[PDB]
């Protein structure tokens, strides 16, 4: 109710600047663009506009997406093709990144800090990682997993987040390697389709398509309040930005917005969509800066390192064996 920080007086942060109101915290840089998948296309929309921008076209079944704001990339999954691809955000140079091994690649997230691509496959019942080029590929979690959908990264915090909508309905987090596998919420869930981190707010939001709620919880999952509890016939994907929440809804076939704290100002940013899928806010502050755990240094032991805790741990591909925390070998 003070946007980002108080102590009577309000405060902004990082690349934000208090609006002519001194509660509101506007983001610096370019205008936020809402980026999202459409089964057939990948599109761009401007939160309070009719606006309409076809970014990628001849696509079979495009579900999950994410990006690398710097490096100017865009990855996306395809559930019939069972592939994960990337492109020049330009919209050019499209290329196969995860070919064999996919069934229902639901979740897809990019770790812009450590240049890693993470995804989930609810057919495979497993979460996986890789280089941006699509190489150095390695499975990450396979234990207990049923139907993982949404996946969120905190490169700064070196943590990963997700939702499991199988018979044990879960919102879990672990560290970017697979350690510290914790339950964030396992109660009053059934269809947790969406999940997003609001760094600048130090909170996580998620979406339940059975329970008709957008929920907010501290990153440890404590202080869990539902924010919106109506107008949610069937929500699928969500994203925060500034004070607003954006989500796709399969019933209303649309991109809806609303207020993070209140759940007031419910809006249909766009109606008449083919099939709204994954959505993100496309903006710099959505990919906030963070220290590379492998920086001016051993950029990945032999192959790829995984920000765990603080001390990044070393990591070997599928088929490979460790031999040390400097060394990888088949």
């Amino acid at each position: 109710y003070c946007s980002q920080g108080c102590t009577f007086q309000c405060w902004c942060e990082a690349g934000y600047e208090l609006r002519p109101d001194r509660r509101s915290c506007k983001a610096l840089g370019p205008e936020p663009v809402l980026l999202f998948a459409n089964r057939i296309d990948i599109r761009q929309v401007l939160p309070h506009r009719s606006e309409y921008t076809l970014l990628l076209n001849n696509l079979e079944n495009a579900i999950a997406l994410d990006f690398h704001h710097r490096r100017e990339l865009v990855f996306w999954s395809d559930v019939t093709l069972d592939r994960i691809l990337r492109a020049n955000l330009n919209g050019s140079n499209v290329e196969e990144v995860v070919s064999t091994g996919l069934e229902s690649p639901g979740g897809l997230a990019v770790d812009w800090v450590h240049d890693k691509l993470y995804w989930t496959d609810s057919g495979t019942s497993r979460i996986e990682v890789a280089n941006l080029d699509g190489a150095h590929r390695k499975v990450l979690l396979w234990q207990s997993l049923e139907k993982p959908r949404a996946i969120a990264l905190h490169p700064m915090e070196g943590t990963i987040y997700w939702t499991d909508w199988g018979n044990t309905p879960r919102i879990e987090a672990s560290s970017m390697d697979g350690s510290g596998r914790r339950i964030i919420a396992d109660t009053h869930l059934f269809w947790p389709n969406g999940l997003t981190i609001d760094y600048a707010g130090r909170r996580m939001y998620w979406v339940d398509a059975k329970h008709h709620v957008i929920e907010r919880a501290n990153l440890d999952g404590s202080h869990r309040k539902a924010v919106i509890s109506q107008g949610l016939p069937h929500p699928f994907a969500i994203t925060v930005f500034e004070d607003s929440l954006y989500w796709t809804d399969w019933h209303t076939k649309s991109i809806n917005s609303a207020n993070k704290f209140t759940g007031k100002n419910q809006e249909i940013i766009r109606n008449k969509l083919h099939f709204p899928m994954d959505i993100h806010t496309l903006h710099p502050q959505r990919q906030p800066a963070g220290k590379n755990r492998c920086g001016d240094n051993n950029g990945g032991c032999t192959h790829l390192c995984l920000p765990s805790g603080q001390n990044y741990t070393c990591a070997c591909p599928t088929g490979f064996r460790k031999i040390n925390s400097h060394a990888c070998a088949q």
Partner: protein, 191 residues
């Protein structure tokens, strides 16, 4: 229910074979790609040519499986990606006596039994195992719909005959109340 149906070679019905009920399953939407087909039906006819049953998207080369009477015999043809095959019943079907048809397809291999004959079996050419389909299913043939370039000639003759007891897989079909595109509620006149 409505228990038998009458086809004039100008009545073409759509049903919904195999879908993804995303609204209900919370599953990501897609084309069902099927390993398996099974269906039973009783048929009585006088025509010696005609398309009776059609599973698949109605599009160009798009996977399909169809049953047509051709030259007084029944036959099953399906195509999965690799070239199709045809399974010709050793049976004469123009006898105006009700006949029970059985068709089943596990991956590449298919079979067909007309009455109490010995099942004519076969394999579709190596390379394709999934019947890739929106889940459309059409009874009696199709209207201005014989899709792409593919088919043998008689697959454009409308049925002209009668059907009942239609099973699609493990589900017994509700003829009238399951129709998704319906001409007219017409029960079958037994001679």
């Amino acid at each position: 229910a409505l228990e038998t149906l009458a086809f004039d070679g100008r009545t073409y019905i759509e049903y919904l074979n195999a879908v993804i009920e995303s609204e209900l399953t919370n599953e990501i939407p897609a084309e069902k790609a099927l390993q398996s087909n099974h269906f039973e039906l009783s048929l009585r006819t006088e025509a010696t040519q005609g398309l009776v049953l059609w599973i698949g998207k109605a599009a160009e080369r798009a996977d399909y499986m169809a049953l047509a009477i051709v030259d007084g015999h029944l036959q099953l043809s399906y195509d999965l990606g690799s070239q199709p095959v045809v399974l010709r019943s050793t049976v004469k079907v123009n006898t105006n006596r009700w006949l029970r048809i059985r068709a089943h397809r596990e991956h590449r291999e298919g079979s067909l039994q007309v009455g109490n004959e010995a099942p004519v079996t076969g394999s579709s050419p190596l390379g394709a195992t999934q019947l890739d389909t929106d889940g459309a299913l059409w009874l009696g043939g199709l209207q201005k719909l014989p899709v792409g370039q593919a088919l043998p000639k008689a697959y454009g003759t409308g049925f002209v005959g009668c059907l009942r007891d239609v099973v699609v897989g493990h589900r017994q079909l509700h003829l009238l109340e399951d129709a998704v595109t319906k001409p007219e509620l017409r029960p079958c006149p037994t001679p």
